[PDB]
Amino acid sequence: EFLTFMNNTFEFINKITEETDVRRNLRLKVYSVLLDETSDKKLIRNIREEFGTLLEGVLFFINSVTTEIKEILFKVLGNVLQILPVDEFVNAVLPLLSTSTNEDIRYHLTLVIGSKFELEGSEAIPIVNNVMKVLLDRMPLESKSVVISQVILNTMTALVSKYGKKLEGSILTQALTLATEKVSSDMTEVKISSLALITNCVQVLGVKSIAFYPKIVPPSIKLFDASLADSSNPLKEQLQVAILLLFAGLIKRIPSFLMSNILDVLHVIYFSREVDSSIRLSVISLIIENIDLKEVLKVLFRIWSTEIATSNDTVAVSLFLSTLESTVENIDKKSATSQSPIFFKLLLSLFEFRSISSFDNNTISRIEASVHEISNSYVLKMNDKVFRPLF
Amino acid sequence: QTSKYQATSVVNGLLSNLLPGVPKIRGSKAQLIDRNLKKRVQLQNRDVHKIKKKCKLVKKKKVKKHKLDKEQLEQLAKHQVLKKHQH
């Protein structure tokens, strides 16, 4: 009865809004008013104000809906979002975020704001600077709600990912400061979204983000250690990937400054249990092609003796073997001779792995097989003078 | 549930940007050692540059198509403000 009337009514609202003639289409009537220079500015303000009330109204029904009527309201909503262009949409919607008092409506409002910029170009740069400042200002206010706190970070990540360099520098430096503070949030979602925001901001800034480096890498390393302890976290896979992708982002953008903390990077990669091997093995290949192979070789000895040797962990050992064989097949002759005493000190330790290994015979004999092929490659790529004392 | 969906989407966005070919988020130990060692070389031979190019073109077409839609709709409305300004 009433529900059938409701279903027909939104079909009636859908039919009017549907963009099936200049006089017929509501979208074209609106834009002509914007074009018309003689149209009174007060009339343009009414269109902006009325559109916001219309957008909120449809979101109110969608928020509080029945499968068929749910679909129609999305048909109606899709029509509404296209009524007026991006320039006026941001002006007519951004004030509504502060005004709106419903948690659900502000959640939906932030999604639609992000969606409008998906297909835009460099014409939207002055608009995006307005959006970013508003989103940054509401982040302190929206700290209570986790879903809204998460969503605002995600949209900011998208806006910084796309044409982020062209944004004003103050916004980027302000956004990065915001993320570094929210990484400490107790909710795992805020950590994941904060880690994603740092990755994109660091990519845009590059070396200019080195001022925030003490606030990025050390806290993330402690976060990984806590990640291992809380294995019951439902977002454990997403968190360990996020910490891993943070390093992958700054292994490519600031290799030289990360040379000092490269050991803790390798500790994250090897012992990141939840992450897939493909993800872990890919972020190794960045290290070889971006970081000096001399330092990796020096760090491979310290990590092996301290952690990997006694780990009794299959994937960590194999990942270590992959790093060691990648380094030797890439390390040049000049570095190989200079770093030789470290590699052979490691080699004797690898040979003695059979004593302390808890694995069975086939594993150790397979591990030793790779240890022998890398040692031959490294002993080649040397000379008589350096190798005779080592032999 | 939105908490899980939002977390995966953000993380999946970074994987595409930084590690294109890598998959997204959704026995004997000697055997396990080899597979990682074999995965190392076959990941090295993957053509990630081709993967980035395909994503760029797909997005570029949609941005291009939307841009023409704005351009065409502007011209229709521009003639109407012209039409009425005459009368």
Partner: peptide, 24 residues
């Protein structure tokens, strides 16, 4: 004729987020 007949036959991104929230 039946033999001929046998030959004859032979020859929104935002939307997904929203409903999850209503479930939540």
């Amino acid at each position: 004729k039946k033999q001929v007949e046998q030959r004859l036959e032979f020859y929104l991104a935002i939307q997904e987020a929203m409903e999850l929230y209503n479930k939540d």
